[model samples]
Target chain A: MKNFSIAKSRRLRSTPYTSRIEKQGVTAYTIYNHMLLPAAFGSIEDSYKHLKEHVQIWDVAAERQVEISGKDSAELVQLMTCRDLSKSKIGRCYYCPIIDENGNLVNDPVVLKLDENKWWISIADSDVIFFAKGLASGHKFDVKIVEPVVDIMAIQGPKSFALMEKVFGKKITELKFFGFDYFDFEGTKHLIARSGWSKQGGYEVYVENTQSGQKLYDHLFEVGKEFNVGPGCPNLIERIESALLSYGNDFDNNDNPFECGFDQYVSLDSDINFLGKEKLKEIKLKGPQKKLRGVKIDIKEISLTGSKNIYDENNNVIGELRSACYSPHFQKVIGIAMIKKSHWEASQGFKIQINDNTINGNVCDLPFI
Target chain B: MKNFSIAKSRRLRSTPYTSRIEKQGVTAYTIYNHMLLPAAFGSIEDSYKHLKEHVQIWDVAAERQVEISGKDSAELVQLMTCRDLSKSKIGRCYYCPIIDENGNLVNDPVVLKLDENKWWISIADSDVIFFAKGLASGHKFDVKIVEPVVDIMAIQGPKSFALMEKVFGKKITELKFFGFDYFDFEGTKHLIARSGWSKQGGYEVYVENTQSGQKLYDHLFEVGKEFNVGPGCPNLIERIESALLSYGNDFDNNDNPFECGFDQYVSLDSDINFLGKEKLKEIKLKGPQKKLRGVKIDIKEISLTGSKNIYDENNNVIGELRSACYSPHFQKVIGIAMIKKSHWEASQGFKIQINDNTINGNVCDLPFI
Candidate 1:
């Protein structure tokens, strides 16, 4: 394995807690939305193991927030995603798939309804802000689409609730999944949401004031010592085990929501007009030819960087693996793959060619946890 | 002083020549448009010196191609930029600024017209593809916006012409600065343009086929051994000396063409309906408050990662420094800054606050070469 050196500029942006994360020994970084996202604390395995038992403060500020506001904010937001936001209440979060006019996924952002005229799409790696701006410009809508200074810091794991409660209050524990509320921190009302990238119970604080970032981080660590809190990022193994789809990894603009098992969130019956309404309606009836699925490789430990094409016995391409990681709990290599409908059924056998070596695997339902 | 590690994934893509570049001892990388761009070979100073003296093969594949095709391609392309494309001829390239309705620069791409109905926007690090898709969808234009599998390999530096002529023929030297033509290579005809990111002079071959990439690269190295061909990227020190503005570093979507000194390209009387024509016209008449200029830093070897705020004697923010690098040739720290109209005059003094230490500098004309 080669240790790749990353060049830093103002472009591969530093988060508010970059200095803090660096001091805590962030080993590797992945660029997301033109910002530095800590990929490993020490290693993926170490980070994953710690995250399962203890709390981890993730500087996910790279999860850039696209703030859409103005008189036509709601109208423009509705035009981008397939989710019916007509009844989208304030303080609610929706996992909506941003689609193009052809019904292809642009990004799967967690949309937050702040008010009637304001919303924030906590986006994936893709530049959804430019898409929003383009739509507003072409349609000549009276909406302001901008990347706000809000950075997201995630407190994830089993002990997340205990740590957060210690910092804020017991009121934070009462917050529902996909729900957000304002919390006071050093004279600022920052939005704290009961949602995170992993399946682990956590809270993602939308830190508005950059000045209080280190103070809040230090304070969390100070109070979270009993809960074993340490500097961390979204764990790859945990995400793969939980069957969480990374936007650029698991799918891209070419993949539809249905193929990624997001059919429930894609509102086809809604009267609201969206970018891919017609295409999605057609796709819903026809159904997806290929779909995303979980796979268990019949191997002990394999080095897989992902994006390997899966094949059948005849060497015909049947699927493509997006991400993979060895699960110590399951004692197997678990991964997420987009399989052909015929081979997508549970227990269906498949083979993956990784650098001239063919590994056997079987399709399974997602969220292996 | 610190070596940063870049975590690899399918998203931070590798070029066709990544293995070759690795073999050539590429030391550092920077992420661009969800792809890996080699930042240095050995060291920045070493790479810069070599590029000025000899030839280098640059895997600038991160300069992704946004292929715009179909019936209304011309119309959609025209609407995205203020550049008058009414007389855009095939085989010619235009350095156009993509802007929004408010006249903010989205990206500065080198627009290539392959056919009357086809164009390619060799984009900067911004998501110009989604923007193009958004325009096509919202306007309901008959253009199919797709990211074609085209990677760019730049043959840059002083010896580039002699090296390219040895491979393609003496006919290549006849190619104009921004002109492109098809040249036979093996069984395919590759589009070779007499254009590159640097002022050192070179050609950019838009490699359409991934299979032939290694072959072409090997052939170039084999034939140009005498020219001292080495692997290189667009050098920071050289770019800074030349006053070339890096998109994400020097300016972003927030700045306008007028502010970036791109007035000659912005056509207000072209009668072409574009996104930011009206706003650009207004700005053109009103005059820009602040504009980009070259700066000569007084100190030697001052650490600047770019985007430092420029201050006047009163310590109030007058403007901002964007990109800076120490020029060994000039024995001075050369940089680019966006200075206010009052401070933008030749030999105007400015102060840059880098951490606790304040460095003195002066604004000057660009392309310091």
Candidate 2:
């Protein structure tokens, strides 16, 4: 077998255009096709440019998708994670955390209530679809798992409301956050969601017409230009501020929702019984050995300064930072770390060992506030 | 043919993980891997965590490789862009802008002086290797264009340095930036560059043992914890602050080096004759019709912005910003615009036509002074 390099990478061999972006001083970045579809910006400018202007429409079909439909849908959803969905009433988006049997987080994704009888689970990266399928197969339920041919694009930014309004018309502006409207565009229908990254206001267009995405893209960029259209994806700097938990970084199968800090998402208060409820019930009674907490590094340096180890005052390792980076907007180093719930006091300082340097960080809430 | 959707894109099916780093209440960002060789953090991080951290080497083989080795290497390089590398001694990196015969910027890349007669060009997006092959082929240069089976692994971070020092013994610390030292690992010899993205310092180990990449990976991370090792890609925001020009944004085949503001690299002063020299000479002599210049927005509210058409005091369209973004370090909206030289020195002011708003801007020097 021949070893592969960029030149021989499947995507590059498929195209003749340069996959990279060029600017005088910045690093060269490229865009390619993945999952047999468009993948990244062709130039480095595309990323920055998308963030600066135009409502960015990404072919982020790579985001994992899971479909929870049929009669037992509600029961199946209840069984999977800790959330009081019995009160989920129609037309609401719930942020839920999925955990393994031991309560380690599998992923944090958004669940949508399409109607009293129908539901959709918007997802992130995880092998949960396989697990969801297995769970459905092993049990008798009113639900069936179906993976739809849906492509999600974010109509995000301050002008999203205006641009989407121009494309989807004024009725879309009436939709609140996490709300969705099935609308037609160029003779095709798309499920437009008011749910997206950055509170600046945006929509996720779940289009079924994959081949015709370019047409919709053209429409958005050309029509929305007057609306200050800007291209966008879930940006890192902004998402960090929101404490948006991605699957692998903040929590994985090695972590449970309880330890991942989702005890709030679990609701024993409601009569709704869900999966892992028994294990969660036992863990709840047993108390959590560790809890996920937000961290803010006071140091301004970018050199692994944000990388840290959770240490007891006596210098014993309890946990470590899951992810850390300089927030572009806040000018601060931020990340989530799993620490003992006993260290939850905001005013109490903790030591984060980064080699010889010991930086003092404080336990903060997920959304940085 | 099957239509591609977000639910079935090849990337989603194959991508085992999404390279995302988010901080709650801060930012939600995902590494756009369109041009990435692996299209995920799997290759680098997998090698780093399970192998590289333990001193087992893996491939950082994705960096765009363009070989320019032959007798006329110097002439071929000089003619490719406005960069005169005659004075650059061997083993140095010089940034150059590549312009086509039509004087359009083909790409911006780094020219590496590998030896007295050999050179390597690293470019963004496009296949510079083929471009070099064509250019070199067009000229009867006595160069052997060999596409090697070589790969680079950046065993980077503080722990990496100590491990290399231990592996190579005392000679490791003397390796300077942009310098390299060849050593043997498990009977396989490789060259190590004392350079990488993180300012924390480490080594970029180049090897021919493609099959043993995993083996080399296992060694680095196993012993690197003492140096506080962590995994991260090149920080986009940080790299932008360093003024690293991304190709396709700063300049492309449609733009010229002089127009892209690479005057320092191109010189009519040197009698050294090169291809496209006459055109560049004409561009310089005629006072380049368009020039790449830096621009800064005047207000704090206008902190983050992107490519917009620059207009003159008379409301005449003058140029377009190739790239622009909010620099946390600069605390303002900054950009690179390739503009008409005639309008560049107006000094008094200019306006950028952004979405729904006309932004005030002025031309400045590179590095966003």
Candidate 3:
């Protein structure tokens, strides 16, 4: 709606592949973890279509890593997140929710267990580093929390496996979902994880050496020629159809893990003590007033950037739609909404106020695809 | 340079005056404190000239207020910053530096003492909230750290006092620099401080009411028309000429107060025990190797969006030029630099490597005007 230009400064940091992205003709950016994230290689719709068919190298370095290590590292990690990490072994990844004392989500990061005394939390937009530091200081845990110089470059799409195999090896294709292993490249070991932001399947290479950023990116493009690889960011359409919840967008610090449909990640039955364990238990007993649900709107080919207020028949506000996009696959506009408990069932009718028009919609099961 | 667009997301937040600023034809933006900061209205040089001649209303809502309140609030506040707060009375602002246990500067904020048990740290960019929370939780201090909804609207320039007098009264001019008092506006009490980010002189009104953001902005424009009020942001040229060092740009968590030329604010002689007191004392006795200094470049006009690496005669890296811009009044490009002690002397020669060119410069004293 407004012609906006992003102001450049050292404060809004540049990633290691900044030059390569610029060379690839990146046209838009978004700030995450205080680093530049390529938002668009082309128009949103164009990029969405290309992402579903071809391979893409995403400069997701903004998914900064917070390294936790010490004698009490595992204890400190368990204290901050509600996920039961007791059984989590090395080279495993878990989608953990870091909550505060009041059961509100501080951040929803993918926790990586590197070793018995080492862990890395690949966080979303908010400063979870501070929360971990606060927990460590509060408990006087013999642990150290620091942001390591690690960046994540994601390769996603149907052809992602082929492209990664060409670069790393055929063994890379064997890595199970949410699993990771170190691969030697340029005489250095880089942790490669079988995970990404989209459901198209991919691998995220944790580039520890900042100096080798451009080299690695260039090598991917060079070797990915046969796979029709192109520069791509997180696709909005694919994510919405897959029901991938963006932390700050789909939910923020205000929402708890349970209300955001993270019940599986909440380990109340476990012996691990966490910051919001008691509060989460209380919330579970009382039940969530609102829960994350999927909705299929009547309108097609609509882009709703901000949250749209959901209303009932009486024009009373029920909840809000957090993420909405035009799903060409479904041939309709699909979205994620935090709906009131009464109207969260499938086929429940509701109305969304988008721009100057009101569009009728129905709540449905998640992963609309 | 690449043609860039900003991604429209709830994470890249909008301010209260976003609509009005869009109407005023804002051309560019930068994200600060997760909020949209208006970067330009016209050209940078045009805005710079206008800022020095007239008045402006800046939507500095991004200057988020970190409210610290509770029984041990004063003690916690004193423990975080090196500034001696024993003599700090109510309704006074102090430019304080928040440091870590290693004596590295975290953030430089204008500290406000609301009461004996309440304080507000109007911080620059960086997670000072985490640092404060870490200290509070670690020390078991009875304090609460929360980012309140208070937003600052800076009315700045030579005609600012006159414009403020018309709206608030002649007594508004009596407010001393770095002093504040509450003024009733639209049936709500808002704290108005005689402080801002420039030497042009102004007052920053801390609007506590979120609903009153647009109303207050409109009121300022209505009464400020006679004084030629226009939309503006912090001018780069004015700040460069005045030698104002921006955190995360000029320096970040890696630099200490002593190296940033904040010797006057570091109160090691005070009886208060702070996080970095012992380390700061060590650095004071040992002396810093590199310190922030002012430099006058030979070029007439230059665009410095990022810090440039400084080199000596042998092309060895010596220091860096952090903030640089063309000072129209002085007709020379000036900037702030952190030079090695051997080269920090006034009139010492150095070279800066800018894009595709080399520029000669000399170290000078700060506040070049």
Candidate 2, A212: how far from true, in Å?
3.7
C-alpha DockQ for predicted model 1: 0.65
**Compared with the true structure, what per-residue lDDT tens digits does model 2 show for residues B167-261?**
66787788778766567777776766776544445776655675554455555555555654443454333434445565545665455666655
DockQ score for candidate 3? 0.58
Clashes by residue pair, model 1: none
lDDT of 2 at A93: 80
Worst 10-residue lDDT window, candidate 2 chain B: B20-29
TM-score for each of the candidates: 0.97, 0.47, 0.96
- Candidate that scores best on lDDT: 1
Native contacts kept (model 1)? 0.64
lDDT of 1 by residue, B85-145 (tens): 9999999999989998779988899999999999999999989999998888778898888
User: Candidate 3 — which residues are off by over 4 angstroms?
Assistant: A301-305
lDDT of 2 at A91: 65
lDDT of 3 at A72: 94
Model 2 lDDT per residue over A1-369, tens place = 111112112212121111111111112111221222232333322543455454555444545356778887777676666777777867678887765444445557788787665677776654345345435533545565555666666766666777777777778879888777778887887777787755556777766686555577767867876765544345544555777765645665566677766777888757775555667788889888877777777776442312246777888776667766566455567777777766776655777755468887777777874
lDDT for every model? 0.88, 0.57, 0.84
For model 1, the local distance difference test gives: 0.88
Regions of candidate 2 where Cα sits further than 4 Å from its true position: A1-59, A87-91, A115-118, A140-144, A303-307, A328-330, A353-356, B1-369
Clashes of 1: 0
